[PDB]
């Protein structure tokens, strides 16, 4: 268990696209983006390294290191000050991915945690709970994928907090995914996204899954709701993987060539849920899949649950 890195409140990320649509990258600032996040990052991979290392079991020290890093980001409020903006929100997105990692991680290592981290940890998930949601106050932050994955964070900081008020939040900010669902499977601010449309409709599915899954945890079964609307997104993702045609066509744009990976293993959970799961096959056969800012491997946990289980 290395020692925990500083968490510093503040932020300073660099937007790296080029173009209106968002899909074009400038490589220099993708580099230097990609220095500046690098605590934010390194934070993330190490506490969803440590759960998944937790999940294997016999190894609860592992659980322990990620509540002693979530612990130590808790006491020096990381986070939770300026969001440096230099050419984009960049900063506030990261914020929101990082809080989805740190709550994921807390949620499936809670029950180790002391009386003291418990109570650290909480409240520093619910202060970036609100401190995210406020940033969606604004009308001009447009709702699209980033406003998905603040819900993991939210939804994850509700489950491991059982708070029914972040719950509903949560809730809401799933069903806006669900209802932007046009009736041909897209959604249209991430069809905006040219070359990169298929990719983003994957990212987009990617928290809305994940946020359906951890209301199982609840009981709950969050696919009845427009029941049948997230399986046509989903299906489009399959199918454009196969063939991108659709998305070509629908976006204007020759769909950049790539193959499922990290965040696109929500398909893990979503072929258990789906009425015809084997057309997830040839995008399960790209696993197994790995992303902290879901919560570690989303193959085994599909298998085994989120939360292991002590
Ligand atoms: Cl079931």
Known sequence: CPAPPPGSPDIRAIGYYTDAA????????????????????????????????????????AGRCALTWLDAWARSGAMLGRMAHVNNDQSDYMRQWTHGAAAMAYLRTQALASEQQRTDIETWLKRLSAANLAYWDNPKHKRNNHYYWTGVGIMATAVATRDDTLLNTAQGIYRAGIDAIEPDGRLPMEMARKRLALHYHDYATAPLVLMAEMARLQGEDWYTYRQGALERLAARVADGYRDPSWFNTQSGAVQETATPKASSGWVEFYRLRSPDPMRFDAMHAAGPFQDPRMGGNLTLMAQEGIVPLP
């Open 22 to 61: 968002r899909s074009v990258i400038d490589p220099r600032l993708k580099t230097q983006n990609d220095a500046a996040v690098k605590p934010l990052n390194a934070f993330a991979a190490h506490v969803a390294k440590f759960a998944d290392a937790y999940a294997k079991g016999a190894d609860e020290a």
